[PDB]
Design a protein around this ligand. Structure first.
Ligand code: FES
Length: 115
């Protein structure tokens, strides 16, 4: 069954509700639709905001990532029972109407990485 949608709740707090293909990453719809959105991974670029929280409907089918990857989320405060990386898990046939919210971070200690 063809074409899908994604809701994101903004860092500023608005809701924005967009049409997409399957196989797209949440970081790739955030950066492909140019959501006003920054975060803890990759310089806020091609690796990206990382941090989302999902609806308890659409997480419930979903995988979880390594202790190095779920940490990239944990640099936000108060991290939720459905808070997750944009990046492991994409738009698929299971998702027809999915949401995420896009939370705020700033940590007391900070670092950088490059190739
Ligand atoms: S934005 Fe890079 S692993 Fe999530």
């Amino acid at each position: 069954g063809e074409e899908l949608k994604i809701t994101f709740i903004l860092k500023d707090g608005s809701q924005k509700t967009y049409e997409v293909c399957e196989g797209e990453t949440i970081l790739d719809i955030a950066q492909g639709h140019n959501l006003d959105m920054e975060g803890a991974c990759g310089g806020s670029c091609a690796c990206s905001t990382c941090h989302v929280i999902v609806d308890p409907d659409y997480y419930d089918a979903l995988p979880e990532p390594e202790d190095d990857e779920n940490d990239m989320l944990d640099l936000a405060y108060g991290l939720t029972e459905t808070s997750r990386l944009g990046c492991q898990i994409k738009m698929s046939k299971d998702i027809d109407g999915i949401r995420v919210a896009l939370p705020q971070m700033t940590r007391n200690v900070n670092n950088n990485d490059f190739s």
